[PDB]
Symmetry: D2
Subunit: 350 residues, 4 copies
Amino acid sequence: PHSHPALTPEQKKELSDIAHRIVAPGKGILAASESTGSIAKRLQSIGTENTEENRRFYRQLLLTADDRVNPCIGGVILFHETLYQKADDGRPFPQVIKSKGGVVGIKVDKGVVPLAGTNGETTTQGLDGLSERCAQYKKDGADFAKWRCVLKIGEHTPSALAIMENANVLARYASICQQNGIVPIVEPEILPDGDHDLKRCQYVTEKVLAAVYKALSDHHIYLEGTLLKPNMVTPGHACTQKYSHEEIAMATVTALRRTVPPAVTGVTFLSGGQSEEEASINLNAINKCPLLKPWALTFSYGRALQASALKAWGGKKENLKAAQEEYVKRALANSLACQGKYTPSSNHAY
Amino acid sequence: PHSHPALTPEQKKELSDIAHRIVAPGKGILAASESTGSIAKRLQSIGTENTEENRRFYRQLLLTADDRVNPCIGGVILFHETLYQKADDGRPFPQVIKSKGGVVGIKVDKGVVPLAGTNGETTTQGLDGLSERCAQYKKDGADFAKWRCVLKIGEHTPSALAIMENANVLARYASICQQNGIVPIVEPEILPDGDHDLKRCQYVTEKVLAAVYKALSDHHIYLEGTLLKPNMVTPGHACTQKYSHEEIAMATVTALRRTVPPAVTGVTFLSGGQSEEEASINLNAINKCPLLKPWALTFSYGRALQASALKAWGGKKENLKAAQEEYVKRALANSLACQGKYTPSSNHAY
Amino acid sequence: PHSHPALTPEQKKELSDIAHRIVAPGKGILAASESTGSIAKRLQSIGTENTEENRRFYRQLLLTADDRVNPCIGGVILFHETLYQKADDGRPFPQVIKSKGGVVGIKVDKGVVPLAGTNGETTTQGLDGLSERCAQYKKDGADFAKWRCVLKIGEHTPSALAIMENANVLARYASICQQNGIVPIVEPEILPDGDHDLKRCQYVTEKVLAAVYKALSDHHIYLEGTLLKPNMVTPGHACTQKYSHEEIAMATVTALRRTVPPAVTGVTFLSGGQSEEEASINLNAINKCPLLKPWALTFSYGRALQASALKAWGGKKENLKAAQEEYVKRALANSLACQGKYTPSGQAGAAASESLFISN
Amino acid sequence: PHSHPALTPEQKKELSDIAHRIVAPGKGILAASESTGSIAKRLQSIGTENTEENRRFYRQLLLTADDRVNPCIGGVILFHETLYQKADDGRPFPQVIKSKGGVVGIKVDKGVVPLAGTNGETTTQGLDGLSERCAQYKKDGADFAKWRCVLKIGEHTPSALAIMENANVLARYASICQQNGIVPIVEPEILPDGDHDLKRCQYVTEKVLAAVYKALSDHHIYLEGTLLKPNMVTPGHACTQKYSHEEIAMATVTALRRTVPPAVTGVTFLSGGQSEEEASINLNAINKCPLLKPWALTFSYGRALQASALKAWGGKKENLKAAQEEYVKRALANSLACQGKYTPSGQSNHAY
């Protein structure tokens, strides 16, 4: 085949530099790009009305936590709405994030859609006019993006079609992002839903990631200018057999070692509904795994970083401080976790 | 694999019946779905302000041609704007089309976008929210759709990426259309630009179509409920070697026979900028080709049906009758052509 | 991309002409390429010692049947051993076949081998030195070849790997054959084993054939110079739900119309485990199916053409005439079937009704 | 979407231990599996008759070099004939190799064959009966294998078919090998022939390796139990533009980092016609490259290890010691190179 440089040396350096800053040692990502529809249940759990002002207040609360979170947060992913909101002092949220040493990210997909002929499987949309949207987001402060694809482990899933199609759409999204100076975070999430075990999850994860990277190669994606946001390898949420954190860490690191090229700048694990402690302990175990890991292994958590903060807030302004404290606690815990320094107090079998 | 019926027997019958009506013996398609941007040039050539009124009048002029076109036109592709316009007498254009025995089609793609890392190649966008759009279009009179992908023959093109990506997006578009009772016309156009000869076009056409149908298969597309809108096999515009219409016909029919499954209801050849006469003579030769053709071989022409009409109209409402007369003559000419009855006055070598 | 002609117009003509002669109207194929270990079983049932002479004799019995089979047999597939054996008059079997207006075929695959990491799935070997073998077989009278790939319907089969690998190897085999003037019969057999239903078999057959032709395209295979030997679309041998011959034909022709390009010269169905009558009745229904069929739809039967013959012979040289008579009967029946003009109702024999199914 | 373990934990352990021993720190591979037809050219360059005894003597000359090569040679690839030959003392060559701390390898492919419809491209044959052959070779002292696929850079090559077919056959070969306790060395050699520059080779190498590993994944290949034998990324032999060893190293390591999973135990670079000295300097530069490399980067050299030895020997028994000394010198040099400690004495990242 013949080469037709998709990117210039300058464009590569920009993308690579951004990717490295986000996952710099001890740093991780705050995934706060929930939409009105997904954050609705969050707020209703604390009897708080889901208005634009309350969403703004809650996001301000997380974004303006004291400097203790600075060394822990390399990036913050915002939803469109939030990217254009301002703190009480009039400062745009992207500015608030940057001033704290964080890189600003933006969710760009437009949700999942049903794949006809499959057993409830989906693909993700959002490519239409994506280039122009990225150019605008870039001008408005964002340097990286989020696009979520969802795959499910079942009797006949994920199917060959679901894997191939989701891998392909992720490559398209990545290509467009890189053309506009936006570091794409590739997210092929395999849900923990089901009664499958650890080995089954490792197997599917390995097959999905191999497909993802072949697609990235086919689409001429610059890996140094990307990040990977995969599910950790864990047993199904309803799996009868139980496993230790060390087993989870081994399955996860092994799967990644067998599929993720060293060129990938970093891996930002999704929380996948895990609890704040569970997510921190597993990340720590992953970093302590005695196997060689050529990429940063950090976090990109949503509720695993917000759960306690949201609850402490309870929708009451006088609980601002108490709420931010909980967030700071999870940021500190996960910052230590991505270094294998967190303490709450035969690989051939894989 | 495991079957998870994308369509029910009823849905299949509906799509199959629509597809067959469009390409019924002697019938073809009037491709009139030009956008304001694509219609601009042609209106400029006749010194006419590109206004919605003139566009409506022009389209009205074509859609209201006398009853002689009825047995010639099985379908009419409209642009979004036109689908919601009405004739002077108040009748919605879709209704005008159906009263004349024609099926209403709607262009649903959102144009081409560049593929990074390629030598000027593209893919096509338009999948976002396509399902809701198809449902809306169906409710408003449309029974089939148009989606144009574009490939080019060059030194290193069409590339493996371009072929694969375009085939895949065409499959997604087809899948969504069929879920909403809309017959998708699969259009993988290979431009005639370049100095390549006839065999080079035939080779590329065979490779592209083979990739198209494998992709349709992977996406569980119901072939009986689709139509194929390919380029005819011809030498490039800059090719110095001359060929007869019989050779063009042999190369065309041979390429289709080697790649298009018999289950495909019909082939509606795109005019690809050919002249009115050229398009008719070639279609005629293709239908007279000795080889066995398991599918209808007809037309889906743009300028090949509108050329003389647009010119005779020249924006003059007074030329209405003269303009329509030109359109009628080409509809009649191509109706005979798709039956191998039009007259202006060794296969192993393929 | 760019075209680097794999074949010349002359080579294409020779391949196309051969493929057409094999499936000419009313003609089918006699699949007599059973190996020693495979035919040993057949000779065992009739209590006949599996020796080279008995095999030679039996094959001679089929190849030398009276001239009534001439218009019925377009081709005869032989095993390596048989290609080099002679009839009692010293005539090489290939010459015998040819003198009766038939094209000689040769089995070239070296059997199936297990695909590691799968649930009992396989792929087929035999590509090593295939080019030289084809060039030699061509000189020795062969004009087409046979290569069998086997897939099975189950909970997780056929897997993505099994389908892709078998489609790819078939494509390599077809490529090498065409380079040596040998028409390759593409055979992606989907076993009838299991309790799946008709629509399940149809779904799998469509997916398998789609993969097969995409692979043939990738490998620059000249379809007009090839033939397809697929399984008919039927329910699993253990399926409880019953289907009519018209339903089997509808499912079969539908799967074919949805995947097999018109350029393919002909489809020569394998009988699977169907009895002599079942194979004939289904083939007839297929040819009577209303749907448009751009390719010849005929047969390439092994036991579906030899069942009654073997029984009548029993290993007794004195039952020669009786044995050949049964073979001739099935050849005539299938010759009519591949034209949609077969109507049983008679003395076909109980042996022609017995299921020839053998678990895999 | 379901797993059916191709290998057991015991089988994986055996394959992993073998792969690691071969590329342990400071060790590389002696590629001495030249066929009679291939070795004929070598023997003729020194006016030596191509007989089985002369071939035996030559191979013995290499295999019996003094203990200095022991820490330098992790493996030795032999041709079928040599696997069954013996040293003067009667010791089977596989025993000689093992006694010196080396692992024995066997070439199992049956050469390249033309791919119809392509511009002189090929694929490789040799899968037929491969499983029985591996079981037999395993029993007779072999623990790893060699299978060479050849791709060429040209106006329209490597084509999609060539890349896909070669990647697939390499996967089938690896699968069969692992079922028989044999560590497969995956060899997708992209020839250096042509006037293409460094960037083009890097581009083609990246695409080829991407296809190779996707195929290995599709065939359920255990990467920890495999080694990769790729070409270094260099300009074409006819390229007018000149490049430094540092650039060749950066392009090479960059291509590997972008395509080879860290699970792969090691990369054993083929010499590909490079001179003895050039191959050592490039390997050393590769090991010094300021980028993270999660796999051993060593050698699997043929002529880059035998060139001088073959010449010094000249086919005369009296030159044995002089011939072995030449081989030993290259073994020591490359042992240092695959550690980045090589010296003639003996003691812009985003532009890729």
